[PDB]
Amino acid sequence: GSHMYDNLYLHGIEDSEAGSADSYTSRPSDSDVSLEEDREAIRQEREQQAAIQLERAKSKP
């Protein structure tokens, strides 16, 4: 599964595109939309956002 919607949770690691069909804004809020439309150009950087997931893992829910 490539549901990296968790990336949208992006608390503090901007990188162009957000994620994909998920209800979370990049920083100012929360919005659900098919943001999988990430540019193939800057997506490499966006992939680094995936690393953010590791950062998110630090969350103690």
| Domain spans in the chain, listed from the N-terminal domain onward | 1-61
Spatial separation of the C-alpha atoms in residues 15 and 1, rounded to whole Å: 22
CATH of 1-61, one of 3.30.1310.30, 3.40.50.2300, 3.20.20.80, 3.30.450.20: 3.30.1310.30
User: How far lies 15's CA from each of 51, 58, 61, in Å?
Assistant: 11, 20, 25
Spatial separation of the C-alpha atoms in residues 46 and 13, rounded to whole Å: 10
User: Beta 32-33 vs 22-23: how paired, if at all?
Assistant: antiparallel
Spatial separation of the C-alpha atoms in residues 35 and 20, rounded to whole Å: 4
User: How far lies 21's CA from each of 36, 41, 53, 59, in Å?
Assistant: 7, 20, 17, 22
The experimental technique behind this entry is NMR
What the block records as the tokens of 10 is 């992006």
Contact by Cβ (8 Å): 18, 10: yes
What the block records as the tokens of 13 is 């690691």
Contact by Cβ (8 Å): 19, 4: yes
